């Protein structure tokens, strides 16, 4: 309806509370396996932030799985950084992690993170 009011901080507050659920491991419904390392998350959040998880979990079959193993060439630290971004909007980009973060974001199909990593790499050349 046309006649609505909007709470400016609502989307951020919701994300904060989803991140708190993640940290307390409440209603997490998937374990993402990256090399030997394990990451518990919510399928909904993963889908909302990644082109790859949107595709996996829209699939009738793969969506009922509690474990998802990622390509062995995926750096765990790179995935951990991107998983923290999904739930907080903050990306921990450092000189020593930008290559692994960009490679991981391309794989996860996270367009904005890819574009940003490109601009930051171009600046250092």
């Amino acid at each position: 309806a046309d006649s609505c009011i909007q709470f400016t901080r609502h989307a951020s507050d919701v994300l904060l509370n989803l991140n708190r659920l993640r940290s307390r491991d409440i209603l997490t419904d998937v374990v993402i396996v990256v090399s030997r390392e394990q990451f518990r998350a919510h399928k909904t959040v993963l889908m909302a932030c990644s082109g790859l998880f949107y595709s996996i979990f829209t699939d009738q079959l793969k969506c009922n799985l509690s474990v998802i193993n990622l390509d062995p060439e995926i750096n765990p630290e790179g995935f951990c950084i991107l998983l923290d971004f999904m739930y907080t909007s903050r990306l921990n980009l450092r000189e020593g992690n930008i290559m692994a973060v960009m490679a991981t974001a391309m794989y996860l199909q996270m367009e904005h993170v890819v574009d940003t990593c490109r601009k930051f790499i171009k600046a250092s050349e």
Binding site: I56, I68, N69, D71
Partner: peptide, 5 residues
């Protein structure tokens, strides 16, 4: 094992 390629 299997992975997501």
């Amino acid at each position: 094992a299997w992975v997501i390629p």
